[PDB]
Design a protein around this nucleic acid. Structure first.
Lengths: 138, 132
DNA sequence: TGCCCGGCCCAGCCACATATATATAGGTGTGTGCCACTCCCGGCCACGGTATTAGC
DNA sequence: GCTAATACCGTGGCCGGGAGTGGCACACACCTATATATATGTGGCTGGGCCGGGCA
C-alpha cells in the first residue's frame, strides 16, 4: 500500500493486479489497509496514464497511443457504462484504435497479454462500435 | 583367488591414429623381414614402426580391502606405433582447425514486449517451483 | 457421386469477488511466558616437553 | 672447566551447567458465515448449430 501510495503521488499508474502480481496481499486486506492508510494521509494535513503503458506492452506506434488518448477522453465524456473499472475502458479503447488501423493482434493475444477477458473487450467493443461516430479525431 | 593363467602369451601395444582408433572403439598385417604393414578392409596400408624393441617389466592383466577376481594375460612383446591418399588425411587434419562457437543472439523485437515481461506484467504463477 | 456421424465453436447464463451496514457466535491462530530437554561452552584434570643453575 | 637435576607451561577430552530451543498453556485477536439493495465484471460450464471426413 505504501508503494501504491507513492505511485499515486508521483502521477504514476500501476494497476492493482501488478502490485498484486508482485506481492500476495490477498486483495481484500490490501484494500482495507490502503483505505485506512489513505485516512492516515488525510489526517496528516485518472486512467489516461495507463494508455502509453499498455501501448508499450503491445509495442504500438505513437499515433495509436494519442488516438487511444483522445478515445479515452471522449469515452470518458460520453458516459454510458461510465467505466466498470478503467482497465477495461483502456483495453477496449486500444482495441478499437487498433481495429481502426491494419496492425493485427486479434482479441486472444491482447487478452492474454494485458490479462483481460475476451468477452469483456467484445462487450465493450459492441457499445464502443455503437459510439464509433463521435470518436474520430481527423 | 588370483591365478596367473599363462603370461606366456605375447602381446604388442599399438598407438593408433584417432580416426581409426575411434573406428575400432578388420585388416591383415604383412610382416616384411624389419618393415611390416597393414592392409585394412575396403582400406589403407600402414607401416608399423618397431617403437621399442626390448620391452621388459611390462605385462597385461585383466579383472573379472576388497579383493576381486584377478587374472593374468600375457607379457608385452614389442612396443609399436602405427604410421600412415594421404592428402585427404592431411586436409582433414587441416580441417579440424576450424572449430568455432555460436555468438550471442540479439533480440530484435520492439523492446516494449520484453521490457513488459521484465517487471510487473500482471502474470503470476504459471509454473510450480518452490510453491510449498 | 451421395449420405451419415462426430466434434468444435459461439452465444449465453450462473456464481463469486468488490463496496455498505448490522447482529450473531463461535471458532482458529498467534503471541508470550515458563518449564523442560538438548546443545554448547566453560571448566577441570591429566600428560608431555624444554630450559636453566650449581658444585668440585 | 665440565656435568647433572628440577620446574613450568601447553594441549585435549569429558562433564556439568546454563542457555537456548522447543513445547505447552493462556489470552487476545482475528476470521468465518448469513441476509439487502446496487452495478459491473469475469470465468467457467450448457446447448445448439455448423463443418469436416469416410465408404460404397
Amino acid at each position: 500500500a505504501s508503494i501504491l501510495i507513492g505511485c499515486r503521488r508521483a502521477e504514476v499508474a500501476r494497476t492493482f493486479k501488478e502490485i498484486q502480481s508482485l506481492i500476495h496481499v490477498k486483495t481484500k486486506e490490501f484494500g482495507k489497509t490502503l483505505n485506512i492508510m489513505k485516512n492516515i494521509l488525510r489526517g496528516k494535513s485518472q486512467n489516461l496514464t495507463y494508455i502509453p503503458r499498455f501501448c508499450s506492452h503491445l509495442g504500438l506506434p505513437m499515433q495509436v497511443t494519442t488516438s487511444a488518448e483522445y478515445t479515452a477522453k471522449k469515452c470518458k465524456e460520453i458516459k454510458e457504462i461510465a467505466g466498470k473499472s478503467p482497465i477495461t475502458i483502456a483495453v477496449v479503447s486500444i482495441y478499437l484504435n487498433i481495429l481502426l488501423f491494419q496492425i493485427p493482434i486479434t482479441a486472444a493475444k491482447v487478452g492474454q497479454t494485458l490479462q483481460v477477458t475476451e468477452g469483456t473487450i467484445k462487450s465493450g467493443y459492441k457499445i464502443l462500435y455503437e459510439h464509433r461516430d463521435k470518436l474520430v479525431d481527423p | 583367488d588370483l591365478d596367473l593363467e599363462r603370461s606366456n602369451r605375447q602381446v604388442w601395444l599399438v598407438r593408433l591414429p584417432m580416426f581409426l582408433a575411434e573406428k575400432w572403439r578388420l585388416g591383415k598385417i604383412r610382416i616384411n623381414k624389419s618393415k611390416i604393414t597393414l592392409l585394412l578392409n575396403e582400406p589403407h596400408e600402414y607401416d608399423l614402426e618397431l617403437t621399442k624393441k626390448v620391452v621388459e617389466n611390462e605385462y597385461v592383466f585383466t579383472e573379472q580391502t576388497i579383493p576381486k577376481k584377478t587374472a593374468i594375460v600375457g607379457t608385452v612383446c614389442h612396443e609399436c606405433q602405427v604410421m600412415p591418399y594421404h592428402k585427404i588425411v592431411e586436409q582433414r587434419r587441416n580441417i579440424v582447425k576450424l572449430n568455432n562457437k555460436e555468438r550471442i543472439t540479439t533480440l530484435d523485437e520492439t523492446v516494449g514486449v520484453t521490457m513488459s515481461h521484465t517487471g510487473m506484467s500482471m502474470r503470476s504463477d504459471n509454473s510450480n517451483f518452490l510453491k510449498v
